[PDB]
Structures are given as C-alpha cells and as structure tokens.
C-alpha cells in the first residue's frame, strides 16, 4: 500500500475525548511525507480549552508517514494496510497520575487520510500535571520500537514518553499500543517533533511538525 | 464531482509535440487549487530547446481548476467529468503562419490528476514568429468563451491569444476547442474563464524549460 504514499498526502485528524468527564473534540488538517518523513498538521480544539495540556494528545493525534529507507521497506506494516487501513488501539499510563484508553483506525477515504480517534481517560488528578496543565509546551524526541504480532496479524509497540514540566521535574507516560489491519522485524521510529502557535488563530489549538525516520 | 477539487491536488501534464518534424517531449508537475483557481506547474523539454516558444505551448499544457463561484457551479463541466475526466482537441492557427492540432486526455490517474497530450504542427515558416523565436516569454491575460455543446455532450470554446512580438507586433492564434468526457453522468450556459499567466525561469535549472503561475475565474453570468 505505499503505492499511495509518493509525494504530499493531505491529511484530516479527529478526535472524540473524554477525560475525567471533560468533554473535548480535536480536528487537524494538513499534509505528509512520507518520502521525507514530513509531518506537517495543525490541530483545532472546537469545544473550548483543553482539560488536557496538548503534548500528551500528541501520541495520539499517524506514523504511517515514517521515512522507512530502501532497505526496510519490507516492514513498512501501517503503508501496507492502505487503503484498507489497520485500527490502532494503546493504554497511556501517566505515572502517579490518571489513564488513557484509545481506539484509532488509519484509512484512506478518497484520496485524504483520516485518522479517526475515540478517547477516554480517567482517574486524572486535578491540581496536578495533566488536569492542572503544568506540563511544559514541548514534545521531545524518542525511539518508538516495533514488534510483530504474531496472533492477530499486526504490530506491537511499548515505549515511555518522557514530558517535560514546569517546575523542573518529569512527567512519564507509558505507551502500550496494538495496531490490527482492517481488510515486520524487530525496528524503531525515531521521531522528532516542534510544537508552534498560530498567531491569527484565537480557538485553542496546536502546530506540529514532525520528522520520522527507521 | 466537484469534489475531488476541494483544497491542493497534484499535477502531471506530458506532451508529445511534433511540430514541423522537430520532435520534442514537455514533462510538467505542480499543484492546483480550484477554491481560488491557482494554478503552479514547472515545465521541463526534455529534449532540447523547443523548436516553437514557450507560450505557444502554454494553452495546450486542465481548466478544472478554474475558481467558479458558488453561484456558477452548475456550469463547471470540467470537474463534473472527472475522475473518469475529459478529452480536449483543440485547433490553433497563427495567423499568416502554420497550426497546432491538440489532443489530450485529462484524467484523475490515482490521486493525481493526469493531462497526456498529444500536439501535431504543419505549415509553419522557418523564417516567422513562431520558429524565428521572434514570440517574448509572456502571456497577456485573456477570456475563454464557453458554450455548450449538447451533440458532442462537451463543451466548445473559441478565443484568440495576442502573443507579443519582440519588434513590437502581435502573433495571433485563433483557438477552437470541443471536450469531450471520457465516461458519462457530465452543459453550461454561456460562460467565460478569464484567466492571468506569469511566464518565470529558475536560475538553477540549466534545461529549457518554463514555470508558471494562473489564475482563472468563472464570470459572465
């Protein structure tokens, strides 16, 4: 299915949140390369003020997009899905603090991706990094192994996103994620990421830009 | 319909030219948006030099992505053709000079949309505007008269390019079109595209080639 990733692909992102009951909905729309590598989106909060500070809906909020070189091609599983797609589900643990549970499926609808996202996070702790959003505006750059999943014909991964916060500690994530085709060797994504604002745009929101390579 | 046009849609436009024996090829690539109506692709011959000037070229090198208003939507036959898309013959005479036979095939070829040409060239002079290389690298703005044609269940359109000369004269080039969709489910009242052209070159590119930027608009109704 990487016949459908040469050259720019245009992209749209939603996500339907619950967190501790806090109802939010995120909608992002831009472009990817995967010839580069380039992920380029800029997400829009139509419900108002995040409960949720944006760096940890990063995750969530595509690696399909990855800039697999000549000789990894071969394990390139979330292309492969295309144009059927594969459905990515993964458990967030935020350590001393609440849970994230998300189902997203990746398919092509016409000639655009969509990335449709379901969350639900709970017992979060108001007054602390999450709910008090004191995690810093940054995302920084991690290795993301993959496995094969020999049961249910998909891909396995487990990795810990370390965030950055405002008084100078850090925040850990635990990431457990399950990825199963809809219709690979032991690898990594490395990825690096900027976060930016739009300075026209007054709803909450966030621009990303992301470089992924294996 | 209409929607495979909503926001940036990739571009590739091939010509194989034969135009008084001088054969040639034209590669061309960009993006095209039919919410504004731009249009910006990056021309490459290559093979060689051209034996005819750029601009002579440059209403043969996909007029879906003209910018018709909300109000004229039902008129876009263009788009309504695609994906299975159109094909447009054209034939152009240079006044006192020779003519250009056109046929292409525009059509959504994936996700991109594909405009394979085929142009023929008789009767030119060696000694004239078009093979003297007498034509400036620009293109004047210009309207394209539309109307329907109900028999060919296309469009016919009639207009005349004002190309300049480098002495200060005017080559002009009578055009007559008739698009003809590829499948069927595609007849607009008469209409017209007013368009604008800029002709550049990028300094990096050591191959004679030709980029440019459009824009065209639906208007008349």
């Given at each position: 299915?990487?016949?459908?990733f040469?050259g720019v692909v245009?992209?749209?992102?939603e996500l339907?949140?619950d967190?501790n009951?806090?109802?939010?909905?995120?909608?992002?729309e831009?472009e990817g390369?995967?010839?580069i590598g380039?992920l380029?989106?800029?997400?829009?909060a139509t419900?108002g003020?995040?409960?949720?500070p944006?760096?940890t809906?990063v995750?969530?909020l595509v690696?399909?997009?990855?800039?697999?070189?000549?000789?990894?091609?071969r394990?390139?599983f979330f292309?492969?899905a295309?144009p059927?797609?594969?459905?990515?589900?993964?458990?967030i643990?935020?350590?001393?603090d609440?849970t994230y549970?998300?189902?997203?499926?990746?398919?092509?609808?016409?000639?655009?991706?969509?990335?449709?996202?379901?969350?639900?996070?709970?017992?979060?702790?108001?007054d602390?990094?999450?709910?008090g959003?004191?995690?810093?505006?940054?995302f920084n750059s991690?290795?993301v192994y993959?496995?094969?999943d020999?049961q249910?014909?998909?891909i396995?991964?487990n990795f810990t996103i370390?965030?950055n916060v405002?008084?100078?500690?850090?925040?850990?994530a635990?990431?457990?994620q399950?990825?199963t085709?809809?219709?690979?060797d032991?690898?990594?994504?490395?990825?690096?990421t900027?976060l930016?604002?739009?300075?026209?745009?007054?709803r909450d929101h966030m621009?990303?830009?992301?470089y992924?390579?294996a």
């Amino acid at each position: 299915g990487e016949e459908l990733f040469t050259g720019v692909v245009p992209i749209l992102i939603e996500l339907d949140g619950d967190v501790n009951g806090h109802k939010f909905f995120v909608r992002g729309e831009g472009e990817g390369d995967a010839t580069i590598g380039k992920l380029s989106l800029k997400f829009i909060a139509t419900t108002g003020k995040l409960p949720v500070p944006w760096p940890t809906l990063v995750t969530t909020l595509v690696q399909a997009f990855s800039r697999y070189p000549d000789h990894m091609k071969r394990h390139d599983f979330f292309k492969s899905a295309m144009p059927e797609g594969y459905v990515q589900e993964r458990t967030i643990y935020f350590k001393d603090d609440g849970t994230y549970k998300t189902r997203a499926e990746v398919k092509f609808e016409g000639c655009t991706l969509v990335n449709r996202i379901e969350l639900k996070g709970i017992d979060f702790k108001e007054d602390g990094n999450i709910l008090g959003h004191k995690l810093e505006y940054n995302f920084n750059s991690h290795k993301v192994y993959i496995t094969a999943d020999k049961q249910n014909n998909g891909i396995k991964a487990n990795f810990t996103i370390r965030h950055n916060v405002e008084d100078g500690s850090v925040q850990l994530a635990d990431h457990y994620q399950q990825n199963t085709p809809i219709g690979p060797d032991d690898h990594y994504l490395s990825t690096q990421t900027i976060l930016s604002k739009d300075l026209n745009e007054k709803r909450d929101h966030m621009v990303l830009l992301e470089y992924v390579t294996a």
